[PDB]
């Protein structure tokens, strides 16, 4: 089986890209949160869902083993997958999107900073050898998916270090948590 | 009455590709100094280097001092892996460089950002 993880900062487009990719690849889409709820790992309290990661990794290993799956979630790179795809975007884009979602100023700020410092990418590289980083900036989901499939078909198992958001730092200052 | 001094905030970002030192005033509205590894070194491969972090911190601290900042509180963003949590020597090296440049060091807080919403981990 082939298990592909799609991760990155909230708002970056994980779900969009995962659905389109799973359809185009002929794989099956699995949202990690819902899967966590089904196996009884996840408990949903008003309205967030708390899970224990080792359990979720256990179940993912058990059930999906064995399958062709595009796994969607910001925890997906912590799962025992074959390949990790880390989506990146200009942190201002993250800020605007999370702003449209109705997140708090502090939460928006933390996730924008999270994209600024490459948090997810660093986690992924720590967890897996096979990690493909993709910049979503100024791209359609179509272009992004064809880029990913193209790299897999090359095949390239590892590409990292393709964005440095420090260069755009000033542009994202309005979203950051700088307040005394 | 013996009292003096003007204090800032040094926001320190340690990423995969770089380091940023952004010094503001205590309110955080005004930018005193802004420096990154990419501004002080020639080669891309040296941008993540702790030496570059130290040099950038040196420039930032100098600029801040000339503008009247006596000391800074530090707010550090230093992501590390989920398996091994290794923030790297960079942020600390930057802080030391700030001190050596003549800045006083205040409170040091680790504000390292945790991306969230979706499933919630413990
Ligand atoms: N490549 C893209 N181009 C334009 N808009 C996008 C793209 N990818 C995602 N979006 C938009 O961003 C928003 C969040 O995308 P989503 O897939 O929910 O991100 P995530 O799953 O990472 O939280 C959606 O409203 C979607 O329309
Ligand atoms: Mg999503
Ligand atoms: Mg660069």
Numbering used by the authors:
A (entry chain G): 0 to 179
B (entry chain H): 8 to 129
Q: Can you quote the paper on this entry?
A:
Amongst the factors involved in this maturation step, Fap7 is unusual, as it both interacts with ribosomal protein Rps14 and harbors adenylate kinase activity, a function not usually associated with ribonucleoprotein assembly. Fap7 forms a complex with Rps14 that is conserved between humans, yeast, and archea. We report that Fap7 association blocks the RNA binding surface of Rps14 and, conversely, Rps14 binding inhibits adenylate kinase activity of Fap7. In addition, the affinity of Fap7 for Rps14 is higher with bound ADP, whereas ATP hydrolysis dissociates the complex. These results suggest that Fap7 chaperones Rps14 assembly into pre-40S particles via RNA mimicry in an ATP-dependent manner.
Two crystal forms were obtained for the archaeal aFap7–aRps14 complex bound to ADP/Mg2+ and ATP/Mg2+, which diffracted to 2.1 Å and 2.4 Å, respectively. In the ATP-bound crystal form, two copies of aFap7 are bound by ATP and two others by ADP. The structures of the ATP- and ADP-bound complexes showed only small, local conformational differences in the actual ATP binding site. The base, ribose, α, and β phosphates of ATP superpose perfectly on those of ADP, and the residues of the P-loop are in the same conformation in both structures. However, the presence of the γ phosphate of ATP is not compatible with the position of Arg100 (LID domain) in the ADP-bound state. This arginine, involved in binding the α and β phosphate oxygen atoms in the ADP-bound structure, bridges the α and γ ATP phosphate oxygens. Compared to the ADP-bound structure, the γ phosphate pushes Arg100 away by approximately 1 Å. This effectively distorts the structure of the α5–α6 loop of the LID domain with a 0.9 Å r.m.s.d. compared to the ADP-bound conformation for residues 89–107. Interestingly, the conformational change in the LID domain modifies the positions of Tyr102 and Lys106 side chains, which interact with the Rps14-CE Asp124. In the Apo-hFap7 structure, Arg100 would clash with the ADP phosphates, and the LID domain is even more distorted. This suggests that the LID domain undergoes major conformational rearrangements upon nucleotide binding and/or release and that Arg100 could sense the ATP binding pocket occupation state and relay this signal to the Rps14 binding interface through the LID domain residues Tyr102 and Lys106.
